[PDB]
């Protein structure tokens, strides 16, 4: 039985309402729950879903150099594969292998409906509406390291805006957009931004083109006997139209807006 690490992040993995009456994999539902079943079928393995102990994706402490999250669970042997919306990045790929992406995404803008902002350039050319990102992570780093004039102007503003425009969690970023009466715009992954829009009170919108391009991938340890098959399975499901189908199902068929 393959041990699958994953993360409770909607709509990827969520507890079914009647989870206490159930056990094992049946306790969960979501895009990644459906994906794990397809990947297992196509690779021929039995598996057990487990939620990542510390509830994190995967980052390496700059001082201690220890890996936390799902990446940590793979490099320290606690799980055999990670099936979740784990972004394919250079630092992670140095230590684990990623399948080809199963979903595309990029940095985007979340506004409270009615905010007169349509792009990153709009935001950079004004100060009435504050804007920020998660206070740690790649989105913040994107701006910090960018050489593009608009993005550098945005970084300059954000780094010294008061009150602080950075938030501790994704949920706080969403709540701040919702409760700031149009005076705060949040930068985050387009997939989450698209998902919010679609969730009641239906008061947020995704605007502008993505500012970068990335992808989520299934992760396995270096030398894993699972890597090759998992990678072919993702390509097959994309070509059969199944990945698009799952995305449409969890974002729109189950949408409320």
Ligand X SMILES: O=c1[nH]c2cc3no[n+]([O-])c3cc2[nH]c1=O
H or E element: which one contains 43?
A: helix 31-43
Residue 96 C-beta: closest distance to ligand X, Å: 12
Other CB atoms within 10 Å distance of the CB of residue 43: 18
List the one residue from 104, 119, 146, 170 that touches ligand X (CB under 6 A). 170
**Closest to ligand X by CB, 42 or 56:** 56
Interaction of residue 192 with ligand X, rule CB under 6 A: yes
Interaction of residue 9 with ligand X, rule CB under 6 A: yes
> CA 253, CA 133: separation in Å to the nearest integer?
29
Interaction of residue 86 with ligand X, rule CB under 6 A: yes
Interaction of residue 122 with ligand X, rule CB under 6 A: no
Interaction of residue 73 with ligand X, rule CB under 6 A: no
51 half-sphere exposure, CB direction, 13 A CA radius: 14
Contact status, residue 42 vs residue 236, Cβ threshold 8 Å? yes
Contact code string over 28-67 relative to ligand X, x by CB under 6 A: -----------------------------x----------
Q: Residues 6 or more apart from 240 whose CB is under 8 A from it?
A: none
Contact window for ligand X (CB under 6 A) among 42-50, 83-91, 116-124, 202-210: 83-91
Q: Could you tell me whether strands 81-82 and 184-189 are parallel, antiparallel, or unpaired per DSSP bridges?
A: unpaired
Tell me which residues in 128-147 interact with ligand X (CB under 6 A).
Answer: 137
Contact window for ligand X (CB under 6 A) among 27-35, 187-195, 232-240, 249-257: 187-195
Burial call 178-215: b when 16+ CB within 10 Å, e when fewer: beeeeebbbbbbbbbbbbbbbbeeeebbbbbebbeebb
Residue 79 C-beta: closest distance to ligand X, Å: 15
Contact status, residue 167 vs residue 184, Cβ threshold 8 Å? no
By CB under 6 A, name the binding residues for ligand X. Answer: 9, 57, 85-87, 137, 170, 189, 191-192
């Amino acid at each position: 039985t393959v041990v699958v690490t994953t993360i409770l992040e909607s709509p990827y993995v969520m507890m079914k309402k009647n989870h206490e009456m159930l056990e094992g994999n049946e306790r969960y539902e979501g895009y990644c729950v459906d994906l794990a079943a397809e990947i297992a079928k196509h690779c021929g393995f039995k598996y057990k879903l487990t939620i990542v102990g510390d509830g994190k994706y995967g980052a390496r402490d700059a001082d201690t150099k220890i890996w936390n999250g799902m990446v940590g669970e793979l490099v320290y042997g606690k799980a055999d594969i990670a099936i979740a919306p784990l972004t394919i990045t250079l630092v992670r790929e140095e230590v684990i292998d990623f399948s080809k992406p199963f979903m595309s995404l990029g940095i985007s803008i979340m506004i409270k409906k009615g905010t007169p902002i349509e792009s990153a350039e709009d935001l950079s050319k004004q100060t009435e509406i504050a804007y920020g990102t998660l206070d740690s992570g790649s989105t913040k780093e994107f701006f910090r390291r960018s050489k593009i004039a608009v993005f550098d102007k945005m970084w300059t503003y954000m780094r010294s805006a008061e009150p602080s425009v950075f938030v501790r969690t994704t949920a706080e970023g969403v709540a701040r957009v919702r409760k700031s009466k149009g005076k705060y715009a949040y930068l985050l992954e387009s997939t989450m931004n698209e998902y919010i829009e679609q969730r009641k009170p239906c008061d947020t919108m995704k605007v502008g083109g993505n500012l970068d391009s990335k992808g989520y991938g299934i992760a396995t340890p270096k030398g894993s006997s699972l890597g090759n098959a998992v990678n072919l399975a993702v390509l097959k499901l994309n070509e059969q139209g199944l990945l698009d189908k799952l995305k449409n199902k969890w974002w729109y068929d189950k949408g409320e807006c």
